[PDB]
Structures are given as structure tokens and as C-alpha cells.
């Protein structure tokens, strides 16, 4: 019942016989998932939650940064003070769910109110030792492979009137996205081994957007809701950037963030980029060319990272664009419901 701050531990299903890098890091750094999850509901309670000021997020930040240091080693790392050249071996890459638990003398409070916006009081509270499994999926614009909202879309913002405050959206309708790099023979041949594409069903996304647009009109009354491409920035933001199978995907989302979306299946152009801007620290990291064979990732869109157009309103239309780049917000989208 007291606000607390201490180091926590992770529990995974990491298998020691696994060469996948997340497991290697998880087997060595996490304890097995508790066999029986004990959760205690409190029948008459209230506590104030702040998803935007939570040490749990900053803790997973330090963890997900550590993972990427074992898994994805750049051939060259340029920062403001240092230059690194090293071996950049390829690795088998897959996110595995991570559970976050409280040590002895501490417990975790979980909001079970289905429509909690992440800031303020929740009339209904529970206590568990360990959080649900969260894949540390690193991405921009689109939130992938996260937990989904029970009843209705949720809008999370520290302050919506603050246009500089990122807007996390949690969906009630997962939308399947497949990004593939088609198979082709070798790097020496004439083929462009960095050409890639995604396929998202047009009707699914177009109708999901309408539901997001609907939930946003409730926080902005008497206004039109518009989705337009990114106003600019690094390539990681202006494109759906993420890592699929150890390779860095940059998927241009002009076809997704459009006011009128076609019914028919959508095809997004992507590119595998060696040269990437690091989210762990401010700097550039260069990775080796892509591996041979087919690279595919069937992922589920469960949330968004949006940024509203500021300034005087031209047409009484509030424009939201895709954004990201601070992976802590990705973690908040999951750990919003927990506090210690």
C-alpha cells in the first residue's frame, strides 16, 4: 500500500537447450515462470496509477537494451565520443515473453478495470507477484505482439492538450500484418537482397482505423479526425521500423495512415537497412547484409503510437500522425496497468 522502488527480477520460459538469443539471455538472467499465478483481488480499494512515471518501464528499458547487446552486435558503432569496430555475427532472433516480478518484501498492483487510461485512480485493484508475459518487441508507429484491450479501444496520453505528448493507442481488434523478404539466390547474383514488402488486409485496418478515429472523437468533441503520414524525422519514425529475425525492417506506411483506405489487400514497400539510428543510445550502428532465404514475420497490430498536429486549426480537423522512437513508450503500453 506504499509507493515503492526496488530492483525486480524476470521470469521466463527460457529453455537452456535453445540457441535463440533471447532464451540464452533469459535462461542466464531470469528464473522460471512461477507454476501457479497467485492473484488476490481487493473487494473495496483505490490507488492512483501513473503509467508515464514508472520505474518498471525504465527497468525493462535497461533489460531490453542489454538483450540487444548480446544478440545484435553492430559491425561498427558510432556515438558522440566513441568509435567501435568489432565482429558482427548473425543470430537467430525471436521475442519471448518476459514476466516481471517483485522481490521479497514487495508486491505488484494491477488495475483490472477494463477501460483504465493509465493515469489517476482505479476503483478496482489486484495484487500478483509476476506480470503477464511481455514480448520486448522493438518497433515504431505500430505496436506488435502486445496484450489487447478487453472491452474497447483505450487512448493513453499524459496530456492530450499537449501536442508534444505521445499518444499510445490500445486496440480491441488485432490486425494481422505480414512482412516478408522474398527468397532469392545469394548476395553475389543480380538480385536486390534488401527489397521487402508487407501485406495488411485493407478492410481490417481501414475499419480498425475508423474505430480508433471514433474513440479519439470522444476526447476531441466537435472535430474531424485525420490520419496522415509522418511529418518527418529519422527513417525509423517515418516508417514502420522493427526487427524481424535479426534483420532491420523499414516499412513505409503511407498506405496505412490515409484518411480513405481501400478495401482490397494492401502492400507496403520495405527495405532492410544496415545503417540504423540506435534507440538504446544516441548514435548510429551498421549491421552486416541480410541473410539468404525467405524472411517473414506474421505479427498482430495491437496498438499505435500517434502524434497530433499542433498550432491553430485550419479546418477544425485534428490530424494525428505516426510516431515513435522512444522504446520506453513501447514498454509503457504494456506495463501501464502495473505499479510497485
Amino acid at each position, epitope marked *: 500500500w506504499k509507493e515503492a522502488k526496488t530492483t525486480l527480477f524476470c521470469a521466463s520460459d527460457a529453455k537452456a537447450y535453445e540457441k535463440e538469443c533471447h532464451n540464452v539471455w533469459a535462461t542466464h538472467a531470469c528464473v522460471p515462470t512461477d507454476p501457479n499465478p497467485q492473484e488476490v483481488v481487493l473487494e473495496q480499494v483505490t490507488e492512483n496509477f501513473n503509467m508515464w512515471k514508472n520505474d518498471m518501464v525504465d527497468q525493462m528499458q535497461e533489460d531490453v537494451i542489454s538483450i540487444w547487446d548480446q544478440c545484435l552486435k553492430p559491425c561498427v558503432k558510432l556515438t*558522440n565520443t566513441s568509435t567501435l569496430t568489432q565482429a558482427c555475427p548473425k543470430v537467430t532472433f525471436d521475442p519471448i515473453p518476459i514476466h516481471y516480478c517483485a522481490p521479497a518484501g514487495y508486491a505488484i498492483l494491477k488495475c483490472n478495470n477494463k477501460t483504465f487510461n493509465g493515469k489517476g485512480p482505479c476503483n478496482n485493484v489486484s495484487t500478483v507477484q509476476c506480470t503477464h508475459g511481455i514480448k520486448p518487441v522493438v518497433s515504431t508507429q505500430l505496436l506488435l505482439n502486445g496484450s489487447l484491450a478487453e472491452e474497447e479501444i483505450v487512448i493513453r496520453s499524459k496530456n492530450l*492538450r499537449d501536442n508534444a505528448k505521445i499518444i499510445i493507442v490500445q486496440l480491441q481488434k488485432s490486425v494481422e500484418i505480414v512482412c516478408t523478404r522474398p527468397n532469392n539466390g545469394g548476395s553475389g547474383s543480380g538480385g536486390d537482397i534488401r527489397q521487402a514488402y508487407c501485406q495488411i488486409s485493407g478492410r481490417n485496418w481501414s475499419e480498425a482505423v475508423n474505430q480508433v478515429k471514433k474513440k479519439l472523437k470522444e476526447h476531441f468533441p466537435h472535430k474531424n479526425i485525420s490520419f496522415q503520414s509522418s511529418s518527418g*524525422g529519422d527513417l525509423e519514425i517515418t516508417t514502420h521500423s522493427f526487427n524481424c529475425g535479426g534483420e532491420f525492417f523499414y516499412c513505409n506506411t503511407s498506405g496505412l495512415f490515409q484518411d480513405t483506405i481501400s478495401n482490397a489487400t494492401i502492400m507496403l514497400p520495405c527495405r532492410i537497412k544496415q545503417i540504423i539510428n540506435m534507440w538504446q543510445e*544516441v548514435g548510429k550502428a551498421i549491421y552486416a547484409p541480410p541473410i539468404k532465404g525467405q524472411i517473414t514475420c506474421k505479427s498482430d497490430i495491437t496498438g499505435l503510437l500517434l502524434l497530433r*498536429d499542433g*498550432g491553430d486549426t*485550419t479546418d477544425n480537423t485534428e490530424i494525428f500522425r505516426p*510516431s*515513435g*522512437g522512444d522504446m520506453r513508450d513501447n514498454w509503457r503500453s504494456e506495463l501501464y496497468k502495473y505499479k510497485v
Partner: antibody
Amino acid sequence: VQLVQSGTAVKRPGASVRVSCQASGYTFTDYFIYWWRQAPGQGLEWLGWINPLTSQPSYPSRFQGRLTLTRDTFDEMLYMDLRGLRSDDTGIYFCARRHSDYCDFDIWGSGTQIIVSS
Amino acid sequence: DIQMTQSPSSLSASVGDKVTITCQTSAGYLNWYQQRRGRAPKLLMYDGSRLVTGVPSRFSGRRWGTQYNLTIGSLQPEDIATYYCQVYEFFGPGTRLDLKR
């Protein structure tokens, strides 16, 4: 804790211009930079803000596509690129550090005078 | 977005006078700045009531509801300049203070 801006720059109409602030004395990546301009004897107009951490810029509709904000973390310098220079683009251009979620601007540059003329 | 009104548009006072200024905003988080001749603004108070270190005690601010007031206890030659009220990305129209003649 200071921002130091470029000097007076003159460019012909329809050309492109650059202004730069250099941060010093504080962690560059933790504070938004808001850009403002004011013509002579007039109020401040919003150019946009940029997030030094993630590079994300936001602009007002009026200047959409004509103005772009960029960052350089190795130099700790902020840039403001304005193109298609009209006559009304003449004026003094300021950069300010957004200190807090209150949105107070505590640290300001001393302004960059821009002049548009043949 | 935010609607902002500042009045009066102009004001005149002399040393030792009591000068009050007001701006109104539907939205919260107002801040006040001092802009002297040909110089960038100086942060005076943030949140309308909270004073920033390094600013004299002559300055104080109180706000009630949708109204924010800026008051100077004893004007001095330095203070004669344009004062703006801000909130988020929007700046007020501005009020310019001139010596009484």
C-alpha cells in the same frame, strides 16, 4: 546552459536558408527545442518543435512542407531549414529550450535575423 | 486548441506604480515572459503562479479560473518592455508597457 544561434543571413526570394543553435551546458537529448520567429514590431509566431532524442519534428499547418527541423547530436546543434523564401519570411528567428511539462521556456537563443531580398 | 486574450493591448506607468496585466486561456499551463527591446524573452513565472529562481520579489502572480494576472509591486526603469503570456505552442498577442507622460 545556453543556446547560440547563427548570424544574420540574407537570401534572395524563392531561395533556401539555414539557421543553427548550438546547445551547451546541459544534456542535449532531454529537452525539446521550440522554434519561434517574430517580424519587426510584432508578436511571436510558432515555427515548430523537435525532439532531440528521437528526431521527431512537429510543424504548424501554415508552414507544412516549407519548413523542416533537424538535429545533430554529435555537434549538439539544432538546425532550421526554411525554403521557398517569401517576402514575409523577413524577421528574427528564436530557438528556446522547453524545460518541463509545464512548457516553460527558460533558455533562449539571442535570435537570428533573416532578410529576404534580391 | 487554445484561445488566448490579452488586455490591455497597451499600458503606461511610472516608477513605483502598480502594474497589472491579464490574459485568459481556455487551456491550462500559462507562463509569463519579459521581452525587452531587441532581445529574446526572459522566463519570469511558470504555471502562472510559480516564480523562477533569479527573478525579483517585485514580481508575483495569481490566477483564478480562466484568468491569469501578472502583477508588479514596484515598477523600475528596467521593467518597461513588452510582456507576453504563453501556453504550450501559443503565445499571447502581447502588451507593451511605456513610461507615463
